[PDB]
Amino acid sequence: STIEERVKKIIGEQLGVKQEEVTNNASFVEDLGADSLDTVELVMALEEEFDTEIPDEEAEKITTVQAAIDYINGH
């Protein structure tokens, strides 16, 4: 699977949403019903399945699915 599919799979599983809801312009909190701790463990799962450390200052910047795929792409 491409990295976009892996990011969407992690998001859909962590936030408990069907894969058809994981839209690229959807926000974790606004569209998919997350709080702080939800997005924190979401980023932690992304860090695990991609072997990449994400600083806290750079993690708050990742709020949508597109922000996650862009970070995994560039890094």
């Binding site: 962590q14 936030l15 408990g16 702080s36 701790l37 939800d38 924190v40 463990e41 932690m44 450390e53």
Partner: protein, 411 residues
């Protein structure tokens, strides 16, 4: 005086996942003790426990929410949902500020504590889950239920070890009797059959090692006991003011009339030989209810199947009752369910209530040869039908010498 009655029941036990299935299995002398299969028990001296079989909370707690809570929290939520549904209470915005909870646990989320500390020891604090604290601390059961049902009343959580279940219920009634609430969801939940739980209780030499026959391991008052058996589950009661319950046309299982407390002031894990603290707790429950020991038909004893604890509780009951000692009935359901620790006094309170509804007494199984010199009838092997039973008494004693007793009256 404001009177408190029970209007709802909910329970998860090693012998059933509802109140009635558990009650049926207890009256039939069914053992819910089996070998541990969720972790390797090769090096553990005790390889069995009273586990909850075929647990399904998926219809109540989503998997995203399930990952944020230890198993004991999931047990408490499920039992609390059952009790709220059994009461039929309708939560309004005028009702909210008068309904709260009093739910606790003996040790709490050992399983997720181990998981988070394992991640910490393997990959540092960055691998700790952000849900660690809210998934393990003992009050979160009361937290979630109040969020799920919009309860805005007083929420407390008593964690007095093996006495939690009774204390949480007792002070819930107190909170109602004082006027701070009209309805309270009270009880306890426990899931200590973890590596740290089984290993730590075996380190203290408090667990039975009858691995060759786990269902015969729990033998309260029997001469060949060798420690207690761990049990998991949760018990939840819905306490309500009596006028509030009749005005609502609620179902009323029984009335909570007696609540006594005491301390052993002896040892941190062993009770005194004479059982002074247990007797003081029972006497305070009697005087708080305003009855005599003879008026008690059934005592759901603590009965952990330890050598010292069984003798101490039998001696305390003999002291409290005297002439009625040969008359009053006493049994230990932990012979079938095991020791549910902070949830013990919760689920056993339910049993005390159901006894008054069905005028029947669950037995003390595995009681082949009772202790010498003990003249009590522990209702051995088989259950016993009774008539005229108007009062039941439930005991709970915990580490630190803390003790509690509850008395329930019919209708």
């Amino acid at each position: 005086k404001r009177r408190v009655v029970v209007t709802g029941l909910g329970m998860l036990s090693p012998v059933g996942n509802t109140v009635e299935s558990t009650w049926k299995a207890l009256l039939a002398g069914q053992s819910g003790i089996s070998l541990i299969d969720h972790f390797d028990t090769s090096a553990y001296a005790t390889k069995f426990a009273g586990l909850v079989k075929d647990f399904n909370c998926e219809d109540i707690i989503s998997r995203k929410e399930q990952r944020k809570m230890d198993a004991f929290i999931q047990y408490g939520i499920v039992a609390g949902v059952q009790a709220m549904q059994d009461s039929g209470l309708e939560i309004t915005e005028e009702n909210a500020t008068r309904i709260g909870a009093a739910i606790g646990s003996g040790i709490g989320g050992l399983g997720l504590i181990e998981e988070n500390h394992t991640s910490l020891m393997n990959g540092g604090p960055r691998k700790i889950s952000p849900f660690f604290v809210p998934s393990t601390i003992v009050n979160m059961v009361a937290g979630h239920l109040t969020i799920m049902y919009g309860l805005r009343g007083p929420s407390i959580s008593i964690a007095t070890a093996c006495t939690s279940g009774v204390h949480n219920i007792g002070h819930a009634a107190r909170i109602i009797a004082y006027g701070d609430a009209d309805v309270m969801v009270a009880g306890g939940a426990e899931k200590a059959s973890t590596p740290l739980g089984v290993g730590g209780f075996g380190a203290a030499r408090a667990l039975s090692t009858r691995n060759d026959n786990p269902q015969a391991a729990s033998r309260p008052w029997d001469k060949e006991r060798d420690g207690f058996v761990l049990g998991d589950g949760a018990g939840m009661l819905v306490l309500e003011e009596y006028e509030h319950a009749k005005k609502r046309g609620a179902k009323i299982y029984a009335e909570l009339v007696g609540f006594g407390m005491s301390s052993d002031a002896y040892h941190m894990t062993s009770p005194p030989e004479n059982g002074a603290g247990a007797a003081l707790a029972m006497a305070n429950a009697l005087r708080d209810a305003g009855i005599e020991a003879s008026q008690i038909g059934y005592v759901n004893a603590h009965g952990t199947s330890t050598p010292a604890g069984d003798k101490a509780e039998a001696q305390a009951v003999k002291t409290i009752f005297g002439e009625a000692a040969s008359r009053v009935l006493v049994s230990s359901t932990k012979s079938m369910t095991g020791h549910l620790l902070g949830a013990a006094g919760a689920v056993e309170s339910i049993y005390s209530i159901l006894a008054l509804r069905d005028q029947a007494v669950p037995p003390t199984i595995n009681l082949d040869n009772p202790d010498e010199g003990c003249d009590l009838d522990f209702v051995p092997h088989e259950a016993r039908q009774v008539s005229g039973m108007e009062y039941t008494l439930c005991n709970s004693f915990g580490f630190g010498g803390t003790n509690g007793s509850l008395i329930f009256k019919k209708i």
